[PDB]
């Protein structure tokens, strides 16, 4: 598991929106319909989402963009 | 985990289905407080 959560903090900075972003990612990951962009290592959805936000590949912005993407694609 | 009677069952179902979603609703002790306050000569209600 992860020992320190700092890369996600640096990617976010506010320290309060990161939890919301990771939670809204993990909820959709666990309900299904999406795939993990980061290769998993037999870990739960929350750790995968937090490693994704730490890697700098997902944030509070592109989620809205992709969500409007499938919303208009319907 | 509180006196929310309509929440404990739903959280149990969300766990066993692996949903992990929570809706707060309202604690029943707050309704207890309202009922015991209305027992005396004091109106109390919650607006919209």
């Amino acid at each position: 598991a992860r020992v320190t959560v700092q890369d996600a903090v640096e990617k976010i900075g506010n320290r309060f929106d990161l939890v919301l972003v990771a939670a809204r990612r993990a909820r959709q990951m666990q309900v299904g319909g999406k795939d993990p962009l980061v290769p998993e290592e037999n870990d739960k959805t929350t750790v995968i989402a937090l490693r994704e936000i730490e890697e700098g590949l997902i944030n509070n912005q592109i989620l809205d963009v992709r969500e409007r993407q499938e919303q208009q694609e319907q | 985990k509180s006196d929310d009677v309509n929440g404990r069952t739903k959280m149990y179902k969300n766990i066993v289905d692996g949903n992990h979603q929570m809706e707060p609703g309202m604690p029943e002790s707050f309704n207890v407080l309202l009922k015991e306050i209305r027992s005396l000569g004091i109106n109390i209600e919650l607006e919209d």
Partner: protein, 98 residues
């Protein structure tokens, strides 16, 4: 009772009330219950008393007159603005718990 020589809100004990009724007849009405206080407060216009208190506070100024009067005005303002009729303070019906 304004015809009789008696204050509107004054104490009149059992012997005193007896002799007052004997002398003034059936004119100086009196009650000894919570309904007495209820009648005393229901037949009392709040706006007139508020204006009188405001005039007294504005005109008469003293170390003790400054206090014990402004809080009365505030209570009157709260009562009139809240809309809660002061007769509701003396309850008639009593709720009980389930």
């Amino acid at each position: 009772g304004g015809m009789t020589n008696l204050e509107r809100q004054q104490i009149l004990t059992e012997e005193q009330y007896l002799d007052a009724l004997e002398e003034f007849g059936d004119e100086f009405d009196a009650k000894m219950g919570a309904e007495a206080i209820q009648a005393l407060l229901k037949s009392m216009d709040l706006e007139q008393e508020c204006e009188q208190l405001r005039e007294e506070l504005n005109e008469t100024n003293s170390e003790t007159k400054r206090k014990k009067l402004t809080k009365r005005i505030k209570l009157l303002e709260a009562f009139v603005q809240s809309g809660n009729k002061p007769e509701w303070m003396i309850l008639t019906v009593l709720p009980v718990l389930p």
